[PDB]
Scaffold this active site. Structure first.
Site, short mmCIF file in Angstrom:
data_model
loop_
_atom_site.label_atom_id
_atom_site.label_comp_id
_atom_site.label_asym_id
_atom_site.label_seq_id
_atom_site.Cartn_x
_atom_site.Cartn_y
_atom_site.Cartn_z
N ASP A 71 0.80 -1.22 0.00
CA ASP A 71 0.00 0.00 0.00
C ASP A 71 0.85 1.31 0.00
OD1 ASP A 71 -2.55 1.08 -0.28
OD2 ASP A 71 -3.08 0.88 1.84
N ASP B 104 10.05 -19.14 3.86
CA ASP B 104 10.79 -20.19 3.15
C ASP B 104 9.86 -21.02 2.26
OD1 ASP B 104 12.91 -19.24 4.68
OD2 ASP B 104 13.12 -21.05 5.92
#
Ligand SMILES: CN1C(=O)c2sccc2N(C)c2nc(Nc3ccc(S(N)(=O)=O)cc3)ncc21
Ligand SMILES: CN1C(=O)c2sccc2N(C)c2nc(Nc3ccc(S(N)(=O)=O)cc3)ncc21
Lengths: 279, 249
Positions: free
Chosen positions: A119, A146
């Site tokens: 944003d 990960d």
């Protein structure tokens, strides 16, 4: 009663407040209980995981009248959009270069931490009284892990959203770099490209249209136009990182926070005179 | 050119002043329930939008005020739908009232046109909280997409805000096709007729969804009192606006 809640901030659910014991000024966001509380916790957690002078700090939370109140760092000069709105003036190239250099340091920190703000816009770049820019409003921020190297949520504010975010192909941190390029146009022109049309029509145009440019290109320096062009590269794989853009001639040649003093004084003076007439 | 009423500003006649589309559709319309295009010079509606009236008085509308406004709104929708036009942005902010109290459909910026070759539109457009599920699904849609928006607008006039107002717009858009049809926040506050009217508007299947002609015959709409019951609503909102303008001087 830990805080003395004062006026609503900005030009909104954030209020200025005083910590009664210490005298310290804070900004408190009132979350309407109808909000998705799971999204609020991801927001708070992202802010807690950040320890950077270029990222707004989270202090704590409290419940009052069924509402959740989020206590955060107060930035004296308000947002960049508030400053543009108060003075009714767009920013100079020098003011933009300085603000984007601090914004890029916050982006570099976030992206190192595998966070995507999602944003970025002038409304979410806040300045403290000394003129230091801070990334704020992590309400829509995403976290790479990960197991999750790319995010897929179509989220943000349409005029500032990157093409790959809209295309639903999976995206990463450089989506904030595209939003930063739109924000640079917004600070120079007062509004992002396509501001006068429907946000849902902008959503459809962004992946197909060529990269936006300045409305009047001849009014801007070559370094500023090239900086915007490097942010607005449609291919996210080819798009420059925040680390690389900190070395762009437009950003590298940024004067200190000192050149923002008049900008901040004039905006705060308009706010004070407006508050004095309301009495 | 006088004050701003956004980008709209206020013979003796008062007027309100991609872009081709908003004008073309407006020229093709000749209805007392649809804002007129003069030459962008348009018809001025004295009482402002329904959302302006809710905001000025800081009060939601009564079931009777909603029944009357939605009856005039449904006549405008019936006219548009006969003309094979889809407004695509029905919300309280686009329903304007003249000084008398007559509702008019306004802002044809995103309106669509069905033709002999195009029986369905495909553009994902509108304002997310008011958008119909089939518009978001990209399967092709027609005029009854405005009927779903009208159902959300009825909830918005009664509660002050549409359902999912505290959810992010982009997250809400993604849930609308899978969510069950929205209901009132406190159903016990409303009559069987109002709750059934909202339920008929919010039928997820567009093929089964009622038309504007059929909803004009729903007991909630059919029993609408005249524009006279809106006089106090309009006077109180205009009085707040005038007192607000007087303090700015
Ligand atoms: C905590 N915080 C925010 O996360 C965000 S993100 C978008 C808005 C906010 N808000 C409003 C804030 N306003 C402030 N400071 C502040 C100071 C002055 C003014 S102004 N321009 O109205 O005088 C506005 C905000 N400081 C911090 C924030
Ligand atoms: C031409 N027209 C429009 O297409 C639309 S669609 C959404 C907004 C508009 N606007 C703003 C308008 N405002 C008006 N009348 C009017 C009168 C009073 C007020 S108020 N409530 O600020 O006193 C607002 C609008 N009359 C007409 C419009």
């Amino acid at each position: 009663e830990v805080f003395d809640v004062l006026e609503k901030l900005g030009e909104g659910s954030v209020y200025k407040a005083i910590h009664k014991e210490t005298g310290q000024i804070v900004a408190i966001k009132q979350v309407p209980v109808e909000s998705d509380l799971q999204e609020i916790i991801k927001e708070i957690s992202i802010m807690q995981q950040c320890d950077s002078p270029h990222v707004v700090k989270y202090y704590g939370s409290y419940f009052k009248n069924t509402d959740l109140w989020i206590v955060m760092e107060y930035c004296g000069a308000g947002s960049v959009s508030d400053i543009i709105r108060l003075r009714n003036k767009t920013l100079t190239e020098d003011e933009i270069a300085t603000i984007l250099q601090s914004t890029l340091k916050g982006l570099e920190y976030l992206h190192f931490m595998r966070k995507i703000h999602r944003d970025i816009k002038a409304g979410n770049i806040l300045l403290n009284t000394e003129g230091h820019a801070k990334l704020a409003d992590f309400g829509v921020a995403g976290q790479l892990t990960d197991t999750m190297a790319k995010r897929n949520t179509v989220i943000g504010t349409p005029f500032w959203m990157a093409p790959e975010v809209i295309q639903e192909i999976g995206y990463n941190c450089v989506a904030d770099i595209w939003s930063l390029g739109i924000t640079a146009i917004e600070m120079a022109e007062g509004k992002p490209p396509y501001a006068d049309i429907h946000p849902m029509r902008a959503i459809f145009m962004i992946p197909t249209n060529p990269p936006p440019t300045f409305r009047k290109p001849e009014l801007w320096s070559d370094n500023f136009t090239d900086f915007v062009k490097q942010c607005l590269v449609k291919s996210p794989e080819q798009r420059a990182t925040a680390t690389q853009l900190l070395q762009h001639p437009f950003v590298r040649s940024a004067k200190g926070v000192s050149i923002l003093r008049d900008l901040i004084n004039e905006a705060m003076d308009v706010k004070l005179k407006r508050q004095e007439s309301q009495q």
